[PDB]
Amino acid sequence: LTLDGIKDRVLYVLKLYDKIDPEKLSVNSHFMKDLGLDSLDQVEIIMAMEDEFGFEIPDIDAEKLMCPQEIVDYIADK
Amino acid sequence: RSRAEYVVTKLDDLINWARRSSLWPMTFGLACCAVEMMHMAAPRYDMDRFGVVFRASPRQADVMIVAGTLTNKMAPALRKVYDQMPEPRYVVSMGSCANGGGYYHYSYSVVRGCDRIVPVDIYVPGCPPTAEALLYGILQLQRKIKREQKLKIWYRR
Amino acid sequence: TSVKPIFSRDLNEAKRRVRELYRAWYREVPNTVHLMQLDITVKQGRDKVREMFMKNAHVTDPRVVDLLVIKGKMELQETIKVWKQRTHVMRFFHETETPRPKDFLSKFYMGHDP
Amino acid sequence: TYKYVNKKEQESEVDMKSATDNAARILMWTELIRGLGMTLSYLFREPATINYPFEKGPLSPRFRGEHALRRYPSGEERCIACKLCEAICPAQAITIEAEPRADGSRRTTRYDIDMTKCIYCGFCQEACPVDAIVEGPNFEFSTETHEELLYNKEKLLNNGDKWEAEIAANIQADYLYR
Amino acid sequence: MNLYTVIFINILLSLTLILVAFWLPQMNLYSEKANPYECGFDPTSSARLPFSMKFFLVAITFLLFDLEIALLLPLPWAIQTIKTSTMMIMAFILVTILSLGLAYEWTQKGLEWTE
Ligand SMILES: CCCCCCCCCCCCO[C@@H]1O[C@H](CO)[C@@H](O[C@H]2O[C@H](CO)[C@@H](O)[C@H](O)[C@H]2O)[C@H](O)[C@H]1O
Ligand SMILES: CCCCCCCCCCCCO[C@@H]1O[C@H](CO)[C@@H](O[C@H]2O[C@H](CO)[C@@H](O)[C@H](O)[C@H]2O)[C@H](O)[C@H]1O
Ligand code: SF4
Ligand code: SF4
Ligand code: SF4
């Protein structure tokens, strides 16, 4: 649902998030393995998506969005 | 000295007398010590005949009488209402609890003397001090105010 | 090693509650900074929340985690209700406390305490 | 046995007389007038106020006031540093040190009372075996600093020398009750 | 002229007392002193939020009853009329309908405050 337009906004959010090195950020970069974040960092990132896309992502859903891509698939499947 | 210094000194007396003669304490009491404060207002001692009138608003009060134990949970609130009294303002610490923690000095929950929170002008000992002992301390505050030399000090600056 | 659970049957279920409480504290910081007129940034408030959560990152017992969350929800409640005052919230930052030095030599100079 | 404070509900019929008396009471505020009568009657009563500090409230020989350390009629201190007062003090307001005096006497070198810890309970003067520490009759010793209420031995002995004439007479009046 | 003169003096006296009260005393402004009072704890919200009015119906009834007395205040001039019977009937009818209006609102529980 605006599939590529969504991706433009998602990566915008992750670049603002300081803990992510902006060069290493790619649509398939796993938050834990690649970017080297931790569990609470991920929770803040999904909360940031909750702000941009204006809807509630449950704990059960948000626990899975482990790299930028699945966020996009989750959002489009709204 | 000079006639300008004499005039300044007489003005100090006049403004000092006015504040001596119209001391309005906050309606503010914490524990058993406040009961003896009621007895100072009661007919036998009638604090109002000295010009002492309780007002509930800190904006309309000159004296804080810390009449009882000051707990850690109460300390910020007491500091708030002290800060909201317009100046010139005075504090009378009444009873062992307010003076230094008293019977509860060693408690985890008690401030060991209200003079860790606010400046204190008069310390009234006792647990509780009698209504008369409190009245004596109020009259000692008046004599302290009688000694203020703010205009003389301004003149000599 | 057989114990009654409190709320969570395993540390994985407990971690879920921890993340919910963290979200609630994270969203509350900007409202608290604004309503209490705290002289700190929102970023500084959220860093403090993070540091308080990581003070307990080593806990593995699901029951202890359950009780840490229960207490964390209480602290959140007295913060949202403004039962805590500014003095209470600013206590988390220890702004008048000189921290104890961590090296052997500095402690040796100061006194006898380890 | 019990009584009802507000069970007067024996409902009855109303005559014209009682209905008019009820009407007069409502419309002419009669019970409110009785209230004014009471406050008027106090206006013409002599007030109970005394002219402090020229007049004083009555007290009794048992009154627990400012502490003092007493002497024997010779001038020798009564306190022999037993520390019973220190042990019993419910506020731990008493601090004592002692050693043999130059003449070998058992006497204190420290006798402190934190008057801002003390609860003025009189337990020390009950516990003293030699009537050394007493609460005297003085209650007018408010200070301008906290530090002035941390009494040491010199202060407490000066209170004894200051107030012994009244302290002795109060003990003579009450000791048979002790 | 005289009424203008005395009321200006009344205004002048009040404003002078305000100026004295604000410029004579020693000041000491700091944030905790000037924060709003609420019994030693901070307010949890603005005092500017809505404050419910439980007597709102009595309040707007008062608007109508205040124009009723405006219709009654010419009565001292009206009793001078030759047409005494007409004036008396008009005044009696006016007072009676206002009473009936009050009686109706009373029996409708319009004077009871909302809960
Ligand atoms: C064309 C422009 C002309 C130049 C203009 C310059 C304006 C500068 C104004 C300086 C402030 C004067 O205004 C006054 O300052 C004093 C002390 O300074 C403060 O007054 C009060 O508050 C402070 C708070 O600590 C106390 O220190 C002070 O003693 C007390 O009187 C207030 O702030 C104000 O009452
Ligand atoms: C639904 C609402 C009901 C409430 C309203 C009821 C209004 C009815 C009013 C009835 C009373 C009228 O009362 C009436 O007063 C007038 C004067 O005012 C009297 O009139 C009398 O005096 C007047 C002078 O004023 C003479 O000029 C006249 O010839 C003579 O009759 C009448 O004799 C009397 O009947
Ligand atoms: S000093 Fe004594 S009387 Fe006063 S509040 Fe404390 S315990 Fe009560
Ligand atoms: S009066 Fe009571 S509290 Fe005070 S010193 Fe004696 S024993 Fe201690
Ligand atoms: S004052 Fe009395 S009880 Fe206390 S140490 Fe001296 S002798 Fe013993």
XYZ file of all heavy atoms in Angstrom, chain E residues 20-78:
480
model
N 2.497 52.710 45.723
C 3.300 52.639 46.937
C 3.587 51.186 47.288
O 4.723 50.812 47.592
C 2.584 53.361 48.090
C 3.234 53.029 49.423
C 2.562 54.849 47.848
N 2.555 50.348 47.236
C 2.698 48.958 47.629
C 3.662 48.196 46.730
O 4.234 47.201 47.173
C 1.332 48.274 47.625
N 3.862 48.638 45.493
C 4.725 47.931 44.558
C 6.135 48.496 44.473
O 7.019 47.816 43.953
C 4.106 47.934 43.157
C 3.307 46.706 42.864
C 1.949 46.672 43.114
C 3.919 45.574 42.376
C 1.219 45.542 42.856
C 3.195 44.443 42.127
C 1.841 44.427 42.366
N 6.371 49.707 44.965
C 7.665 50.348 44.827
C 8.357 50.631 46.146
O 9.568 50.849 46.145
C 7.522 51.654 44.032
C 7.313 51.381 42.583
C 6.138 51.418 41.902
C 8.312 50.996 41.636
N 6.338 51.081 40.592
C 7.668 50.819 40.402
C 9.691 50.785 41.714
C 8.356 50.454 39.249
C 10.370 50.418 40.572
C 9.703 50.256 39.357
N 7.646 50.606 47.259
C 8.257 50.810 48.560
C 8.962 49.550 49.061
O 10.125 49.633 49.459
C 7.202 51.280 49.567
C 7.681 51.716 50.948
C 8.699 52.839 50.851
C 6.512 52.157 51.789
N 8.322 48.379 49.062
C 8.937 47.217 49.715
C 10.179 46.702 49.004
O 10.350 46.851 47.793
C 7.822 46.159 49.686
C 6.589 46.892 49.360
C 7.016 48.012 48.489
N 11.042 46.069 49.788
C 12.136 45.283 49.240
C 11.585 44.029 48.567
O 10.681 43.376 49.090
C 13.110 44.913 50.358
C 14.325 44.104 49.938
C 15.247 44.846 48.991
O 15.709 44.286 48.003
N 15.526 46.104 49.293
N 12.130 43.693 47.405
C 11.689 42.537 46.642
C 12.763 41.457 46.652
O 13.929 41.707 46.957
C 11.359 42.912 45.193
C 10.462 44.116 45.033
S 8.775 43.804 45.568
C 7.877 44.185 44.067
N 12.339 40.239 46.321
C 13.268 39.124 46.129
C 12.525 38.078 45.293
O 11.888 37.178 45.839
C 13.754 38.543 47.438
C 14.692 37.377 47.240
O 15.359 37.275 46.215
N 14.741 36.485 48.213
N 12.623 38.212 43.978
C 11.907 37.350 43.053
C 12.724 36.106 42.741
O 13.879 36.205 42.323
C 11.594 38.100 41.760
C 10.878 39.436 41.922
C 10.701 40.108 40.576
C 9.542 39.227 42.604
N 12.123 34.942 42.951
C 12.683 33.691 42.473
C 11.538 32.733 42.197
O 10.419 32.921 42.673
C 13.703 33.103 43.456
C 13.195 32.810 44.848
C 12.656 31.570 45.165
C 13.278 33.763 45.850
C 12.216 31.295 46.431
C 12.838 33.498 47.112
C 12.308 32.265 47.403
O 11.864 31.995 48.665
N 11.836 31.703 41.409
C 10.787 30.919 40.767
C 9.870 30.240 41.780
O 8.645 30.255 41.619
C 11.419 29.884 39.839
O 10.427 29.099 39.213
N 10.438 29.637 42.824
C 9.617 28.893 43.772
C 8.658 29.805 44.520
O 7.559 29.381 44.884
C 10.502 28.133 44.762
C 11.122 26.857 44.212
C 10.094 25.842 43.740
O 8.987 25.790 44.313
O 10.387 25.091 42.788
N 9.054 31.052 44.768
C 8.160 31.986 45.437
C 6.934 32.295 44.579
O 5.809 32.330 45.085
C 8.918 33.267 45.784
C 8.088 34.317 46.515
C 8.900 35.559 46.846
C 9.788 35.356 48.063
N 10.608 36.553 48.368
N 7.128 32.504 43.280
C 6.062 32.969 42.403
C 5.246 31.846 41.770
O 4.305 32.134 41.033
C 6.646 33.857 41.311
N 5.564 30.588 42.041
C 4.749 29.502 41.528
C 3.381 29.496 42.213
O 3.253 29.918 43.362
C 5.440 28.161 41.752
C 6.593 27.932 40.805
O 6.578 28.380 39.664
N 7.608 27.231 41.282
N 2.345 29.012 41.535
C 1.004 29.044 42.128
C 0.914 28.211 43.401
O 1.565 27.176 43.549
C 0.115 28.473 41.017
C 1.013 27.672 40.189
C 2.334 28.364 40.215
N 0.087 28.679 44.327
C -0.087 28.001 45.601
C -1.070 26.848 45.463
O -2.105 26.973 44.807
C -0.581 28.984 46.663
C -1.150 28.330 47.905
C -0.325 27.955 48.956
C -2.512 28.085 48.025
C -0.834 27.364 50.080
C -3.028 27.494 49.147
C -2.186 27.140 50.175
O -2.697 26.550 51.300
N -0.730 25.714 46.072
C -1.700 24.644 46.261
C -1.324 23.770 47.447
O -1.085 22.570 47.300
C -1.849 23.798 44.997
C -3.212 23.132 44.918
C -3.464 22.447 43.598
O -3.522 23.150 42.570
O -3.609 21.207 43.580
N -1.270 24.382 48.626
C -1.113 23.680 49.902
C 0.226 22.961 50.009
O 0.344 21.971 50.724
C -2.262 22.690 50.135
S -3.904 23.425 50.106
N 1.246 23.448 49.308
C 2.596 22.952 49.435
C 3.023 21.963 48.370
O 4.218 21.706 48.240
N 2.085 21.401 47.619
C 2.378 20.523 46.499
C 2.083 21.248 45.195
O 1.315 22.207 45.153
C 1.566 19.221 46.579
C 2.119 18.224 47.552
C 1.678 18.192 48.861
C 3.093 17.337 47.168
C 2.200 17.279 49.765
C 3.616 16.420 48.062
C 3.168 16.399 49.369
N 2.714 20.788 44.127
C 2.519 21.420 42.836
C 1.126 21.116 42.285
O 0.579 20.037 42.522
C 3.569 20.940 41.850
C 4.889 21.620 42.047
O 5.349 21.699 43.203
O 5.476 22.077 41.048
N 0.524 22.051 41.552
C -0.701 21.716 40.818
C -0.440 20.629 39.789
O 0.648 20.527 39.224
C -1.096 23.038 40.152
C -0.416 24.086 40.933
C 0.842 23.486 41.461
N -1.451 19.799 39.559
C -1.353 18.748 38.557
C -1.859 19.187 37.192
O -1.670 18.457 36.214
C -2.126 17.504 39.005
O -3.496 17.836 39.244
C -1.541 16.963 40.276
N -2.475 20.358 37.097
C -2.978 20.857 35.829
C -3.106 22.367 35.926
O -2.854 22.970 36.971
C -4.320 20.222 35.471
O -5.214 20.285 36.560
N -3.505 22.969 34.816
C -3.804 24.388 34.780
C -5.090 24.688 35.540
O -6.018 23.879 35.585
C -3.933 24.853 33.330
O -3.791 26.255 33.223
N -5.135 25.870 36.149
C -6.391 26.401 36.650
C -7.285 26.914 35.528
O -8.409 27.337 35.794
C -6.124 27.518 37.657
N -6.812 26.886 34.289
C -7.558 27.388 33.149
C -8.377 26.315 32.453
O -9.030 26.614 31.452
C -6.598 28.044 32.155
C -5.997 29.336 32.666
C -7.008 30.463 32.654
N -6.405 31.745 33.016
C -6.604 32.418 34.145
N -7.410 31.972 35.093
N -5.985 33.569 34.319
N -8.379 25.089 32.960
C -9.207 24.044 32.395
C -10.670 24.251 32.781
O -10.977 25.016 33.697
C -8.724 22.677 32.869
C -7.302 22.309 32.443
C -6.925 20.946 32.983
C -7.141 22.346 30.929
N -11.596 23.598 32.080
C -13.018 23.793 32.384
C -13.360 23.438 33.822
O -12.915 22.423 34.357
C -13.712 22.854 31.394
C -12.770 22.757 30.266
C -11.419 22.751 30.889
N -14.173 24.287 34.439
C -14.667 24.092 35.797
C -16.183 23.995 35.706
O -16.848 24.982 35.382
C -14.223 25.242 36.700
C -14.681 25.118 38.122
C -13.908 24.464 39.056
C -15.887 25.656 38.528
C -14.327 24.350 40.363
C -16.310 25.539 39.840
C -15.526 24.891 40.754
N -16.727 22.816 35.993
C -18.145 22.569 35.759
C -19.016 23.443 36.646
O -18.723 23.658 37.822
C -18.484 21.100 36.003
O -17.862 20.267 35.052
N -20.105 23.932 36.068
C -21.088 24.768 36.748
C -22.347 23.940 36.981
O -23.084 23.650 36.036
C -21.383 26.000 35.903
C -21.934 27.196 36.636
S -22.680 28.293 35.421
C -22.616 29.866 36.247
N -22.593 23.559 38.233
C -23.755 22.736 38.543
C -25.041 23.540 38.671
O -26.125 22.955 38.611
C -23.516 21.947 39.831
C -22.230 21.145 39.842
C -22.102 20.222 38.638
C -20.915 19.310 38.790
N -20.696 18.453 37.605
N -24.953 24.857 38.819
C -26.119 25.726 38.929
C -26.355 26.520 37.646
O -26.904 27.619 37.683
C -25.968 26.670 40.121
C -24.733 27.520 40.075
C -24.768 28.786 39.524
C -23.532 27.052 40.584
C -23.635 29.566 39.479
C -22.395 27.828 40.536
C -22.449 29.090 39.983
N -25.950 25.965 36.503
C -26.039 26.697 35.242
C -27.479 27.069 34.891
O -27.708 28.116 34.283
C -25.404 25.874 34.118
C -26.188 24.655 33.746
C -27.146 24.711 32.748
C -25.985 23.458 34.405
C -27.873 23.605 32.416
C -26.709 22.347 34.069
C -27.660 22.421 33.073
N -28.456 26.238 35.252
C -29.842 26.554 34.918
C -30.381 27.686 35.782
O -31.093 28.562 35.285
C -30.726 25.312 35.053
C -32.196 25.506 34.672
C -32.337 25.994 33.223
C -32.995 24.241 34.902
N -30.060 27.685 37.076
C -30.406 28.826 37.918
C -29.767 30.091 37.364
O -30.365 31.169 37.396
C -29.982 28.576 39.382
C -30.462 29.706 40.277
C -30.502 27.248 39.888
N -28.542 29.975 36.844
C -27.825 31.138 36.335
C -28.544 31.782 35.155
O -28.654 33.008 35.085
C -26.404 30.741 35.936
N -29.041 30.981 34.212
C -29.716 31.585 33.065
C -31.161 31.934 33.392
O -31.736 32.815 32.746
C -29.613 30.713 31.802
C -29.983 29.249 32.061
C -28.214 30.839 31.224
C -29.935 28.379 30.845
N -31.751 31.297 34.399
C -33.016 31.784 34.933
C -32.849 33.175 35.531
O -33.722 34.036 35.376
C -33.547 30.811 35.981
O -33.561 29.486 35.436
C -34.936 31.199 36.423
N -31.732 33.406 36.217
C -31.445 34.715 36.790
C -31.410 35.809 35.721
O -31.799 36.947 35.994
C -30.120 34.639 37.561
C -29.548 35.973 37.934
C -30.020 36.657 39.036
C -28.537 36.540 37.187
C -29.497 37.886 39.380
C -28.013 37.772 37.527
C -28.491 38.442 38.626
N -30.973 35.483 34.503
C -31.004 36.457 33.413
C -32.421 36.926 33.118
O -32.651 38.117 32.889
C -30.408 35.869 32.138
C -28.919 35.619 31.979
C -28.653 35.057 30.600
C -28.146 36.877 32.168
N -33.376 36.000 33.083
C -34.755 36.388 32.824
C -35.360 37.112 34.019
O -36.081 38.097 33.848
C -35.589 35.165 32.457
C -35.040 34.187 31.414
C -36.042 33.067 31.205
C -34.710 34.857 30.094
N -35.075 36.646 35.238
C -35.623 37.304 36.417
C -35.048 38.702 36.590
O -35.688 39.558 37.203
C -35.359 36.467 37.675
C -36.251 35.251 37.826
C -37.054 34.799 36.791
C -36.281 34.561 39.014
C -37.852 33.688 36.949
C -37.084 33.448 39.175
C -37.869 33.012 38.141
N -33.850 38.957 36.065
C -33.276 40.293 36.150
C -33.926 41.273 35.184
O -33.878 42.482 35.425
C -31.771 40.244 35.891
C -31.006 41.273 36.703
O -31.627 42.231 37.199
O -29.777 41.129 36.848
N -34.505 40.795 34.088
C -35.289 41.679 33.243
C -36.701 41.853 33.776
O -37.345 42.854 33.468
C -35.320 41.157 31.807
C -34.243 41.725 30.877
C -34.408 43.226 30.655
C -32.858 41.412 31.416
N -37.178 40.910 34.585
C -38.462 41.078 35.248
C -38.433 42.218 36.254
O -39.408 42.962 36.378
C -38.864 39.786 35.945
C -39.117 38.618 35.010
C -40.579 38.275 34.852
O -41.436 39.039 35.335
O -40.878 37.239 34.224
N -37.346 42.344 37.018
C -37.271 43.447 37.968
C -37.077 44.759 37.228
O -37.527 45.809 37.691
C -36.163 43.216 39.021
C -34.777 43.384 38.413
C -36.282 41.838 39.641
C -34.188 44.766 38.569
N -36.396 44.731 36.081
C -36.305 45.928 35.257
C -37.684 46.411 34.839
O -37.909 47.618 34.735
C -35.442 45.662 34.027
N -38.619 45.488 34.605
C -39.994 45.870 34.321
C -40.737 46.344 35.558
O -41.787 46.971 35.426
C -40.751 44.698 33.703
C -40.245 44.210 32.355
C -40.905 42.886 32.002
C -40.490 45.260 31.291
N -40.227 46.052 36.747
C -40.871 46.459 37.984
C -40.357 47.783 38.523
O -41.078 48.455 39.256
C -40.673 45.380 39.050
C -41.472 44.096 38.877
C -40.918 43.020 39.786
C -42.939 44.339 39.142
N -39.150 48.175 38.172
C -38.541 49.372 38.731
C -39.176 50.688 38.278
O -38.930 51.712 38.917
C -37.044 49.363 38.415
C -36.260 48.346 39.258
C -34.901 48.069 38.668
C -36.115 48.779 40.703
N -39.983 50.740 37.214
C -40.772 51.955 36.971
C -41.996 52.108 37.859
O -42.668 53.137 37.763
C -41.185 51.817 35.499
C -40.282 50.825 34.934
C -39.968 49.886 36.017
N -42.296 51.135 38.713
C -43.511 51.183 39.523
C -43.657 52.454 40.348
O -44.794 52.929 40.491
C -43.572 49.951 40.437
C -44.247 48.700 39.858
C -44.044 47.545 40.795
C -45.722 48.904 39.580
N -42.603 53.032 40.934
C -42.797 54.298 41.660
C -43.357 55.418 40.802
O -44.128 56.242 41.302
C -41.389 54.615 42.172
C -40.738 53.288 42.276
C -41.239 52.509 41.118
N -42.980 55.491 39.529
C -43.603 56.467 38.643
C -44.991 56.028 38.203
O -45.849 56.876 37.955
C -42.732 56.710 37.412
C -41.438 57.372 37.707
C -41.240 58.671 38.035
C -40.146 56.762 37.689
N -39.909 58.914 38.230
C -39.213 57.756 38.023
C -39.691 55.471 37.423
C -37.849 57.499 38.104
C -38.341 55.216 37.501
C -37.433 56.225 37.838
N -45.225 54.720 38.092
C -46.488 54.228 37.556
C -47.634 54.405 38.541
O -48.785 54.543 38.123
C -46.351 52.758 37.164
